[PDB]
């Protein structure tokens, strides 16, 4: 990028500042998130991850979506959906029963 | 997880990037459990953890957010994270 | 007087006085309270301390506006300051542009690296406002980095009258406290400072900072007591002239 | 030289290793020449450029380190320099305890932080395994060697044969990369561009163009290019990772010793 910009021009300090501050901005954003003050009115840990994703996307995209519905994205993850039973010892499947 | 923790410490204390100031460094080094949270929260919702637990079994996991929130729930059940971490993640500020 | 001074101290004094002169903070302090030949010091000052002091003065000038319009964080402060400086032209920009027009000053800032050859085709008398703006862009970031790395900032409060110097010092303390409140991202809940005097502003801001320190011992580990103030009975311009005359006497 | 804040030095080896560059480093600053080359044209060119005072800026910066070398090390003529391939046995295990006192504390902090979560990790994996394959009759998942080994990952990594060479090489690479990046970025005062570290047993000189290592117990010298620094560093890091991870996994414990 620097070589081609030297060859052609168009680069400026205020453009590469964004690249040079990237990691620091990431750390600052995480630190801003980590010291937030929250209440326990909503028990998010008792919800399904699909519902959590839907609620999070509704919250973070509010300045564009408003109250409208975003569809076609959420799918279940394998480790939460599945329940494996190893049948042995002449006993019926507990989930099937 | 161990290598992620080591790399976070290296990037925050022994790297040639001059933009990393001192307030960020000691804020992460002195606030309790902050390095653990940074290394353990999934990257899709803010953290630096890039390995989903279901990735150890399948290559395609679907969309990253659902896997990240399922992993956060599993962490809460295993006492690796507190519920307040989930609440903060749910109530973080949006971008533009 | 300055007989005990060494070369490094007099050079630092020259650079600090040049920074104080370029950005007319002294008249700003006076309104809070209700020289064409500039080449030789620019050829005989220290670039690093001058840029750091200039960034400090620039961010101190806009501190009250940054407090009134609730802006938090280094990135947003830099963005707003540069946007205001680019849109509404100042007189300090004109002074800096006139100073940088000289070929030797341009060569110095070119060899130091602030005037990057890549970022645009610029020579002596080619452009002035763009060069001043680039200098300001680098100075702001440099000062922010130094302040966050726990480096003290030192300025000179010079006036013939003692009480006037003390009042100027108090106004500067008030602006610096407001800037520290903005940089700590705790300025959203601050008390309103509209249509109010500087003494009560300082008292209220100090009380608010003390309360926040009481909440958490470190306010996100942001430095506070980095100000180092030296006061002289003579004026700033006289101090700069006196320092440069001793520098001439010692034969550089 | 270009100046920008986005230009970083290389962190890993991406180019080949050329004998000509090392031989030229030997012949620029006047030292005995250990290499014999199939085509020594670069040596002839460098010697003629030396004779006619036609060295480049970087070449002159490399050349003027000989003055520092003669000033510091008094008995310089009785050291023997060793070629690249022959010195790999000593470079692969290089320990300088004096210089690696900065990475040690960071890694200790990392070990402490990891150690404060092994119980949670064990419980997490136990829950996942019990939910994914539940057997009605016993099959207690706790007494699994793979799960039990979670609580000793940091201990196995730390108590490893390749830990100290890795620390030393990482420190060396960090210093050299810091100098190389210091070339590109904005600077206000010009000073020494090298880094000298003196020990009772080792002598280490780091320059953006070279690394010189002298051991005085047996009077041997090693002059290496920045490419060799990255090569040695990531080779030793790979050996460290392989050894630790093979030690942890029960299926590879034989491959550890092998
Ligand atoms: Zn069944």
Coordinates of C-alpha atoms in Angstrom, one line a residue, chain B residues 1-3 5-6 9-10 13-18 29 36 53 57 74-75 78 80, chain D residues 8 102-103 106-107 109-111 113-114 117 120 124 128 153-154 157 170 174 181 241:
Chain B
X1 CA -6.7 -20.9 25.8
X2 CA -3.2 -21.0 27.3
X3 CA -1.5 -19.6 24.2
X5 CA -3.5 -15.8 27.4
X6 CA 0.3 -15.8 26.7
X9 CA 0.2 -10.7 27.8
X10 CA 2.9 -10.4 25.1
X13 CA 3.6 -5.8 27.6
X14 CA 6.4 -6.7 25.1
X15 CA 5.4 -5.4 21.7
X16 CA 7.0 -2.8 19.4
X17 CA 3.7 -0.9 18.8
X18 CA 4.2 2.6 20.2
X29 CA -3.0 -5.8 34.3
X36 CA -9.3 -13.8 31.9
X53 CA -16.3 -25.3 21.3
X57 CA -16.3 -31.3 16.2
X74 CA -21.6 -23.0 29.0
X75 CA -18.9 -20.8 30.6
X78 CA -18.9 -24.0 34.5
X80 CA -15.6 -19.6 34.3
Chain D
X8 CA 6.4 -3.0 10.6
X102 CA 11.5 -9.0 30.9
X103 CA 9.6 -11.9 29.1
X106 CA 5.0 -11.6 31.6
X107 CA 5.0 -15.4 31.1
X109 CA 1.7 -13.6 35.0
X110 CA 0.2 -15.6 32.1
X111 CA 0.8 -18.9 34.0
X113 CA -3.9 -16.2 35.1
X114 CA -4.3 -19.6 33.4
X117 CA -9.2 -21.4 35.7
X120 CA -13.6 -24.4 35.4
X124 CA -16.9 -27.4 31.3
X128 CA -20.0 -31.3 27.5
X153 CA -0.6 -27.3 30.8
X154 CA 1.2 -24.3 32.2
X157 CA 5.1 -25.6 29.1
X170 CA 12.5 -14.0 21.5
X174 CA 12.3 -8.2 19.9
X181 CA 11.1 -0.2 13.2
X241 CA 5.5 -26.2 21.2

